[PDB]
Design a protein around this ligand. Structure first.
Ligand SMILES: CCNC(=O)c1cc2c(-c3cc(S(=O)(=O)CC)ccc3Oc3c(C)cccc3C)cn(C)c(=O)c2[nH]1
Length: 106
């Protein structure tokens, strides 16, 4: 699929190089961040590092399964954190960029 290739080379690359990307490049380490309720509240943790590994290792059935992983990453952040928190503001900025790049999807 050309769309999965676009998601890796264009969408993921643009988001990964953004200034607000770093807290989204790896799973949330709830142990080192002392968030013992994170895995109870967030049933499907998702991050860009896991999406990258999934795109590189032929995990996805289709482009929609990948777009759903990016949406899960954003809403997991909105569910766990409070509105107005910096992490929510960072996810909102990345989401706006993601929707823009996903509008030019082949
Ligand atoms: C209500 C309470 N919530 C949280 O303290 C909370 C933290 C995070 C982090 C997060 C992950 C890492 S990391 O090094 O593990 C991964 C690379 C490091 C810092 C992180 O956050 C901070 C940021 C961005 C700035 C200042 C301080 C912190 C703790 C990610 N994301 C996606 C979250 O949703 C989330 N929530």
């Amino acid at each position: 699929t050309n769309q999965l290739q676009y998601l890796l080379r264009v969408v993921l690359k643009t988001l990964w190089k953004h200034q607000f990307a770093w807290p989204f490049q790896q799973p949330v380490d709830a142990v080192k961040l002392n968030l013992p309720d994170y895995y109870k509240i967030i049933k499907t943790p998702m991050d860009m590092g896991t999406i990258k590994k999934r795109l590189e290792n032929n995990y996805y059935w289709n482009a929609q399964e990948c777009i759903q992983d990016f949406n899960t990453m954003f809403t997991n952040c909105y569910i766990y954190n409070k509105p107005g928190d910096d992490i929510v503001l960072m996810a909102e900025a990345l989401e706006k960029l993601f929707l823009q790049k996903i509008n030019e999807l082949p």
